[PDB]
Amino acid sequence: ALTQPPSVSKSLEQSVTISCTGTTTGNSVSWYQCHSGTAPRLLIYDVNKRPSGVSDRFSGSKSHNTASLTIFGLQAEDEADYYCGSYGSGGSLLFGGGTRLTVLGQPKASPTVTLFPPSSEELQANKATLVCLISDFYPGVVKVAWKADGSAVNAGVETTTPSKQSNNKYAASSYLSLTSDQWKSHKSYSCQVTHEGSTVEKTVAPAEC
Amino acid sequence: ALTQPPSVSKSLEQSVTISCTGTTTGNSVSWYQCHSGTAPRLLIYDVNKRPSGVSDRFSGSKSHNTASLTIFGLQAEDEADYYCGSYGSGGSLLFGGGTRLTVLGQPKASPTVTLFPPSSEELQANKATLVCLISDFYPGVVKVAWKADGSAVNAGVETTTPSKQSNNKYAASSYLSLTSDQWKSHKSYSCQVTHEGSTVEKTVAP
Amino acid sequence: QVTLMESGPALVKVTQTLAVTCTFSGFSIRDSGKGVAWIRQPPGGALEWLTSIYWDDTKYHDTSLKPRLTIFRDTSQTQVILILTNMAPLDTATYYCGRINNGGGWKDHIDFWGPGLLVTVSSASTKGPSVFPLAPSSRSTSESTAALGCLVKDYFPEPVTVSWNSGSLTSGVHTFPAVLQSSGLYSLSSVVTVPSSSLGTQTYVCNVNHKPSNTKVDKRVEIKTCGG
Amino acid sequence: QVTLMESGPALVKVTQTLAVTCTFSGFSIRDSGKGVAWIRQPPGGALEWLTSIYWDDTKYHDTSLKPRLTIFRDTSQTQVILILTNMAPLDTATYYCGRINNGGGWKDHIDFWGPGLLVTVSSASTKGPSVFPLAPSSRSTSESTAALGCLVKDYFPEPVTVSWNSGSLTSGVHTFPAVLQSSGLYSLSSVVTVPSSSLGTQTYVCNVNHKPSNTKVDKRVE
Ligand SMILES: *[C@@H]1O[C@H](CO)[C@@H](O[C@@H]2O[C@H](CO)[C@@H](O[C@@H]3O[C@H](CO)[C@@H](O[C@@H]4O[C@H](CO)[C@@H](O)[C@H](O)[C@H]4NC(C)=O)[C@H](O[C@H]4O[C@H](CO[C@H]5O[C@H](CO)[C@@H](O)[C@H](O)[C@@H]5O)[C@@H](O)[C@H](O)[C@@H]4O)[C@@H]3O)[C@H](O)[C@H]2NC(C)=O)[C@H](O)[C@H]1NC(C)=O
Ligand SMILES: *[C@@H]1O[C@H](CO)[C@@H](O[C@@H]2O[C@H](CO)[C@@H](O[C@@H]3O[C@H](CO[C@H]4O[C@H](CO)[C@@H](O)[C@H](O)[C@@H]4O)[C@@H](O)[C@H](O[C@H]4O[C@H](CO)[C@@H](O)[C@H](O)[C@@H]4O)[C@@H]3O)[C@H](O)[C@H]2NC(C)=O)[C@H](O)[C@H]1NC(C)=O
Secondary structure (H helix, E strand, C coil): XCCCCCCCCECCCCCEEECCCCCCCCCCCEEEEECCCCCCEEEEECCCECCCCCCCCEEECCCCCCCCEEECCCCHHHCCEEEEECCCCCCCCCECCCCECCECCCCXCCCEEEECCCCCCHHHHCEECCCEEEEEECCCCCEECCECCCCCCCCCCCCCCCCECCCCCEEEEECCCEEHHHHCCCCCCEEEEECCCCCEEEECCCCCC | XCCCCCEEEEECCCCCEEECCCCCCCCCCEEEEECCCCCCEECCECCCECCCCCCCCEECCCCCCCCEEEECCCCHHHCCEEEEEECCHHHCCEECCCEEEEEECCCXCCCEEEEECCCHHHHCCCEEECEEEEEEECCCCCCCEEEECCECCCCCCCECCCEECCCCCEEEEECCEEEHHHHHHCCCEEEECCHHHCCCEEECCC | XCECCCECCCEEECCCCEEEEECCECCCCCCCCCEEEEEEECCCCCCEEEEEEECCCCEEECHHHCCCEEEEEEHHHCEEEEEECCCCHHHCEEEEEEEEEECCCCCEEEEECCCCEEEEEECCCEECCEEECCCCCCCCEECCCCCEEEEEECCCCCCECCEEHHHCCCCCCCCCCCEEECCCCCEEEEEECCCCCCCCCCCCCEECCECCCCCCEECCCCCCCCCC | XCCEEEECCCCEECCCEEEEEEEECCCCCCCCCEEEEEEEECCCCCCEEEEEEECCCCEEECCCCHHHEEEEEEHHHCEEEEEEEECCHHHCEEEEEEEEECCCCCCCCCCEECCCEEECEECCCCECCEEEECCCCCCCCCHHHEEEEEEEEEEECCCEEEEECCCCCCCCCEEEEEEEECCCEEEEEEEEEECCCCECCECCEEEEEECCCCEEEEEECC
C-alpha cells in the first residue's frame, strides 16, 4: 504494498479526496482512522463501501487504482490520521501507513511559542535544554524551522495528533539541547514556527527571566 | 507423590536413616535437600552414587523400593527438608512430600537481640515504628512481648515465625507501630523475647 | 455488543518474550465468518498488523515475524494469547487485539475493539530516579504558557504523571512530552502550563513520578537568583 | 564453570497469564540424558515438576495440568521458555528452571538448579519501597561490638535486597525474612557489623534494590 499521500491539507466542507493504491482490484479494500490513544476506528467497509453504523460525513468509492475517500462537514478533531486496508492473497490483511488530514477551512489561529529558559536551575546543573514548546495554533499541523549558530544536537521525532489543548487549538514540542556554556558561547537561538502559515518566533537572552 | 515420613528427630551424634517409596520402577531415585527460602541442593544420584565434590557426610545407599538416604556423622547444620526424585512413565518425573530433620542434644543458644526507634519521615506523617530484631537462638522457638508504656501491640502485630540463619541458629523480627504523638506521649520503648521462657530484653531512648 | 480486553505487563527485559492476552465476548468464536487479529503501534509512529484467527482455527501471520511470533488460545478459558520472542527495545508499542469479519468467500475486514494496551520494551533502571526542575518557563516564552517542567533520569516503570501548583493558574493547557531518551533507563520531561510570566526565581515544586514506584529524588526551581 | 538462570515478570495479575525464560552456561551440549526442566514449589510447600526438554526437541508434559502449560524455545536465542494458561492466584510459588543429565536414557540427574523466580499473584499491581536508617539517638557500646542497618516498608511484592557499600564493607551481617505489612504490603530488615565509636570517619551504606519497580537507592546508615 500500500501507499497513500502525506496530509491532503484543505477544506471545511469542499470535499477532500484521500487515496491509497496497492491492490488495484478493490479486493475487500477498506479504511480506518488513528486518533488520541483510540481504537483504529472504522471508516470504510464491504468491497470499499460505507459502513451500516456510520454517518454521511464520508464516502469511499469502489473506484479503481484510487481506493478513494471523499469527506464532508469537516472539523478540528478530524485532523486525525487516516489509513487504508485490504484482503490480499490468503490471510494477508494489508494495512496502511498514514495521511494526517489538515482541516484548513475551520477558522485559523496563529501559533504561540516557548523556548526553554537559560534557566536559574540549569545554570547550576550545567545544562542548556534548548527544547521549544508551541501552543494555540489552528490548523493543528506545525513544524519548526530553527535558527541557531548551527548547533543542532539532541534531535527528536513525533506525530502531533493527540496534543489538542483545553482551548481546542493545538500544541507541540520541538527537540534541541546542549550544556550551559552554550547559553553564552552560542547565542543566535530562535524557535521559528510555521503551521501552514504565520512563521512565529521566540528568541532568548544569555540568562533566564 | 513419592511417599516418605513428615519429620525425623535424633541425637547430634547419631547416623540417621531416611527412606521414601518408589510407586513404580524406583531403581534410579535421586536425592535433593531444601534448607529453606533458597534454591535446593543435589544429593545422591543414579542409586548410591556420591555427587562430585559436595559435602562428604551424606551417605550413598540403596533399597529396592524403600529408596534410602542417610548421614554418617550428623551435625547441627543438617536441620533441613529432604526429598526423593524419580524417573517415571514417558518422562513423568516424580517427587516426594519432603521429610524435615531435627538435630537434638544441640545447645539451646540464648537470643541475640536489638531494638531501633522510629524515623523523622514517619514523624512528618503522624507515624512511628519500633523495629525489634531477634537472632542467634536455638531451638527454632519464639513468642515476643512489648512495653510501649503499659499498652498492647499496635498498628501492626507483624511478627515472624522462627527462621534459620546461615549457622543452625534461628531468628525473627517484630514491628510495633504508633502515631508520632503516641510515640512522644509514651516513655517506655521496650521489646522482650520470652524464647523458651527465657527473659531477654532491649529498650531505646532519646 | 461484542467486547474485548487488552492485558499483560507494562514492560519486560530484553531477550525475553511478549505475553499478552484478550478474551472474545458478547458473541462467540463458533460464530461464522468472524475471527480475531492483533495490531501494534510504536510511540508517535505508524501502526502494524501481526496475525489472525478465523471461525475454523486457521491461524496465520506476517512471515517477516514467523520464527519470532506465535498465537494460541485455550478453550478451557476462552482466551487468546499473543506470543513474541527476541524481545528488543524498538518493539516498544501499543498492542491491540480486535475482531475480524467477512463478506463472501474469502473477503475480509475488521470491526471491533477493547480498551487498548500500551507497552514499553526495555533495558531496566530505576537507579536513583531523579527529578531536575528543568522548566520550559519564565519570560523565555510567548505561548499562553511559561510551562513549569521537570526532567528525569532512570525510570523503568510507566506511566509517568505530572503536577505543579495544583494547576491553579494554568492556560493553553496540554502536558507536552518535552524530551525522551533510552527505553526503561529513561531520561524524559513533561510540563504544566502556567501563563507566559517570569518564573525561575520563585519557590516552585513539582511531581513527575511514574505510578508503580511512587518514588523520586528532587530539587526546587529557585536554585539561582537569575530566573525572573 | 556451569550455572543456570531464570527470569520473567516480578508479579502477575489475578486471572492474567505468566511467561518465563531460562538461560545458562553449559551451552546446548548434547550430553548424558541432557535436557532442561521447569519446577515449582507452593509457598513453603513441597517440590513439583512441570515439564522438560532434551538434546533434540523431544519434550514431555504433566498428565494432571496438561492444557495449563506449553513449552518451546527459539534454539538460536539460547533461552528455554515456558508459557501458561490464565492464572488462579494459588499458582503463586517459588519457580525454578534446572539442567538434566539422565545417563544413557535413565538414572536421574537434575545436575544444576537456577537461583529461581518469585512468581507472585494478586488482583492489585506493584507498589514501591520506603527506606529508613535505624541508628539510635542514645548509645553505650564501644569497638566493633555494634551492628546497624535500614528498614524497608510499603512496597509490594518482593523481592527487595540490600548490599553494604557495593559489597565492599560486607562483614558480620544479619538478614531477616520479610513480613507482610498488614495493609497487604511487605517490609524487610538487614544489618551489618560496625565500630561503635568511629562512624563518619568511614560511611556505611544501605544499597537497597527492589526488582518489581526496578528501584535502586543508596542511603547512609550513620
Ligand atoms: C522414513 O520413514 C520413517 C517412518 O516409517 C521415518 O522415521 C520416523 O522418524 C520420526 C522422527 O523424525 C519418529 O517420530 C515419532 O513421533 C512421535 C510423535 O511426536 C514421538 O512420540 C512422542 O509421544 C508423547 C505422547 O505423550 C509426546 O509427549 C512426545 O512429545 C512425542 N514426541 C516426541 C518427539 O517425543 C515418537 O517418539 C520416539 O522416541 C521415544 C524416545 O523416548 C525414549 O528415550 C529417552 C532418551 O532419553 C528416554 O528418556 C525415554 O524414557 C524413552 O526410553 C520412544 O520412546 C518412542 O518409542 C519413539 O521411538 C517419535 O519421535 C518416528 O517414530 C520414526 N519412525 C520409526 C519407525 O523410527 C524416517 O525418518 C523416514 N526417513 C526419510 C528419509 O523419509
Ligand atoms: C484424509 O484425512 C485428513 C484428516 O482427516 C483430511 O484432511 C486433510 O488434512 C490436512 C492436515 O490437517 C490438511 O492440511 C491443511 O489444510 C489447510 C486448508 O487449506 C485448504 O483451504 C484453503 C482455503 O480455505 C486453500 O487456500 C488451500 O489451498 C487449501 O485448499 C491449510 O490451511 C493448512 O495449512 C497451514 O499453513 C497455512 C499457511 O502457513 C496456515 O495459514 C494454516 O493455518 C495452516 O497452518 C494445512 O495444509 C489437508 O488440506 C486436508 N486434505 C483434504 C483433501 O481435505 C482429508 O480430507 C482426508 N482425505 C480425503 C480424500 O478425504
